[PDB]
């Protein structure tokens, strides 16, 4: 039950994170990333917004490099799940921390943006499911639940 609430919250955090990462890239375009569906009075918009802000220093440094490796990987609708799963599994093989959780959100954002830029529309909800389902089945949602939920990310 605790994990399922974290999974529901993860969908909101990821959609908010995407919205705010895209908006700050625009203020520093993917029309699929300009909508922010949230439940009433949700705190997860603030969580995603703060995570997009606090990772900006590192992300702005490496965005070009990450985009370049994605160009090399050439993800498509047919292989994106396999590649997402392998990369995310490796990311957490040696452990979980809040930084790596944010890196996973950033990977989902950059993957979604990359496929859209290469012509694959309608895929943002697919990547959202990949992120939520990975966290649920690979013990990340449990780790977050043990720290008090995603609201613990507001202290970062």
């Amino acid at each position: 039950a605790s994990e399922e609430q974290v999974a529901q919250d993860t969908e909101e955090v990821f959609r908010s994170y995407v919205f705010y990462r895209h908006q700050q890239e625009q203020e520093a375009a993917d029309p699929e990333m300009v909508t922010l569906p949230l439940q009433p009075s949700s705190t997860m918009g603030q969580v995603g917004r703060q995570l997009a802000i606090i990772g900006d220093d590192i992300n702005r440094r490496y965005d070009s490099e990450f985009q370049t490796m994605l160009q090399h990987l050439q993800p498509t609708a047919e292989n994106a799940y396999e590649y997402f799963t392998k990369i995310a599994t490796s990311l957490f093989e040696s452990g979980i921390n809040w930084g790596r959780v944010v890196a996973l959100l950033g990977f989902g954002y950059r993957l979604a943006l990359h496929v859209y830029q290469h012509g694959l529309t309608g895929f943002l909800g697919q990547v959202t499911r990949f992120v939520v389902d990975f966290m649920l089945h690979h013990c990340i949602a449990r780790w977050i639940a043990q720290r008090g939920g995603w609201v613990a990310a507001l202290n970062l």
Binding site: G55, I58, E65, F66, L91, W98, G99, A103, G106
Partner: peptide
Amino acid sequence: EDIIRNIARHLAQWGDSMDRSW
């Protein structure tokens, strides 16, 4: 799987760098 390994290693490094900064 060279590209997969490299992206995953970058993500862990960037994640650990962020975690240390926080």
